[PDB]
Design a protein around this ligand. Sequence first.
Ligand SMILES: CC(C)Oc1ccc(-c2ccnc(NC(P(=O)(O)O)P(=O)(O)O)c2)cc1
Ligand SMILES: CC(C)Oc1ccc(-c2ccnc(NC(P(=O)(O)O)P(=O)(O)O)c2)cc1
Ligand SMILES: [Mg+2]
Ligand SMILES: [Mg+2]
Ligand SMILES: [Mg+2]
Ligand SMILES: [Mg+2]
Ligand SMILES: [Mg+2]
Ligand SMILES: [Mg+2]
Lengths: 346, 346
Amino acid sequence: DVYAQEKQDFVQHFSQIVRVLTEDEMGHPEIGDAIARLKEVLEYNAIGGKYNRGLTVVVAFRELVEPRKQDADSLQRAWTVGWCVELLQAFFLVADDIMDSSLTRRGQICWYQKPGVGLDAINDANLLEACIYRLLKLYCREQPYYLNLIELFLQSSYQTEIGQTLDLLTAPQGNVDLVRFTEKRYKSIVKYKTAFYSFYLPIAAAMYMAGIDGEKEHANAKKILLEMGEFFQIQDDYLDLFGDPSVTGKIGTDIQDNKCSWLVVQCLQRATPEQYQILKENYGQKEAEKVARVKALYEELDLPAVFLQYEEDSYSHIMALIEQYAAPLPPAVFLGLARKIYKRRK
Amino acid sequence: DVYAQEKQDFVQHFSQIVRVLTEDEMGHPEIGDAIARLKEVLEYNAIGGKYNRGLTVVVAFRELVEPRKQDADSLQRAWTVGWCVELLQAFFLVADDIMDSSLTRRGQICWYQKPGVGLDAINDANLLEACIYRLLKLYCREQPYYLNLIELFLQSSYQTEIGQTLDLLTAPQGNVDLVRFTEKRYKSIVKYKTAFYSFYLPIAAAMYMAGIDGEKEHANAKKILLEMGEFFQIQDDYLDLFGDPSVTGKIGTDIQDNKCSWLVVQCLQRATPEQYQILKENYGQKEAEKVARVKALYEELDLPAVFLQYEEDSYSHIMALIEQYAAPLPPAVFLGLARKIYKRRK
Ligand SMILES: CC(C)Oc1ccc(-c2ccnc(NC(P(=O)(O)O)P(=O)(O)O)c2)cc1
Ligand SMILES: CC(C)Oc1ccc(-c2ccnc(NC(P(=O)(O)O)P(=O)(O)O)c2)cc1
Ligand SMILES: [Mg+2]
Ligand SMILES: [Mg+2]
Ligand SMILES: [Mg+2]
Ligand SMILES: [Mg+2]
Ligand SMILES: [Mg+2]
Ligand SMILES: [Mg+2]
């Protein structure tokens, strides 16, 4: 409910983000066409999601900063930093969709699949990343936490890219990769590719903005948040195959793309030798009938039911971590995030 | 000669760069495979060039810092910042080669063309970019110019990406784009895509490291350097078609790629209406015989000789700018760069 309360306000501020990021068209008109492109890229790729990561910045800031310190300018900085996290997500998704051969995202054709865009989307993606640091400069440069935020975003990006490296290394095209698909490898991939930027980053950013800079407070927050991120990525992998695409907004490519998904890991742990062979002959290939055979195997092994049980046990574990590590931060900071992600269908 | 003096020392420090960037394999072994990938990406893509941009940092630092202040640790910071510029170049080239459909670079097949790499090179490129900020943290975080360097690299990246946007917008695949190929557009593209990061960045970085942070000194340096960058990109465009590939290390794709090259701009200024039509029917297309026809037109219009004359007049103009704007910096700082770029065959 705390996310829904802030959502309209948050999305309304996108206009101002776009206006501020396109405002150099005024002083350097020679870059006009490029700024028009950047606006198109922002409108297509930074809108249409759920805004969970950016909204988390704003909700956390409200909960962590004394209300007498939530002046107009401070709140605007908070909505701007939330939008920075959304721009990071947009950078990542544009590039990921290329690398994953994806078709749709957030209910529309991926940006790179648009006629006339193609591999120029590489540059578009990187432009989105640059916009983060332009926003941080424009709004936060005189604040004591400016450097902490720059470094947090840079570090989060590095960690995420390292995860993406592990994801791509574990999933080579055209090679049987089943031996590589272990729980230990899975946990390492998702910690780096998803958990740092999707969970630690937004809460950390709010913490820094609230003046909470201590190593121990950041570490304790991290303990909760990285585990939440692991669950989130497990959910994401489950939904890639079993999610309703009218809800998720995107077609799944994990099977065709040979990915170390939580699904294929759980399949491997349960498979008879005959099933192992079915998996080997059908995984990591573009043929629709081979993708169908893998899904049928997962259903044979009751993986949906194993997921539902896992979601229950994971929720309980994260709540136990909140009891242990939330203090001295309000537990509502973590509880509002848990509510948002658990039982998520998108 | 000042570049040759520093070159061996500079390249010898690459081992240490790689060692420092791969040293977290020790403390977080779960990312071992990713760090092994990053090492392969660094070895393939950050070596084999001329190192002009990174060496410029080191030469400038030597010339701008009092010799009694060039202690071991300071010099190491200077070689590290030079390598940061080289890593930026490597990020850019890996991604550019994808976007331009290039075949070779620095004498070998482009990284993305390597079997088993492909569009995973998108992530590789971005990893190179992240390494810049990891190096700046590791070596320069306690220095008074740390924030100035972070912001300079971020800004240079943004400007470069804006230029790349103009480059791609002006060169749409499959569309006749001749009307867009003007001198004014050309000058704007190359200022952003090349001149900021290739000329202003390395000298500015050295300036900041020497404690020269003034807006006016940075502006005057910029006046020289952006014009030098324009010449450099004109040279690059000339060499794309007329350079010896055994020297340049890369096959030209500007004609096939529909680019706003200096060549096609100069062609348009000189072309009869019949020649205009030959250009229209043959430019921006992959057919080798059509590329051949454009080259033959350029030679008919004596464009090599127009380039040689342009190089002479440009050299004189840049030298006049040095006389005007070098002070109070040593003119050798700019003169050593001019010597390196003029009469360049690579
Ligand atoms: C430089 C750029 C390539 O770096 C990144 C780009 C994208 C990502 C990333 C991280 C986490 N999730 C995604 N996307 C998900 P999604 O496609 O949204 O289901 P995944 O492909 O991992 O299943 C992408 C991480 C890094
Ligand atoms: C995000 C990434 C796409 O951003 C960039 C990548 C590359 C470049 C860039 C800038 C200047 N020169 C190059 N390459 C040259 P080159 O291929 O080396 O002849 P150009 O293709 O412009 O003729 C690339 C600029 C931006
Ligand atoms: Mg994906
Ligand atoms: Mg992916
Ligand atoms: Mg997914
Ligand atoms: Mg190129
Ligand atoms: Mg190019
Ligand atoms: Mg070129």
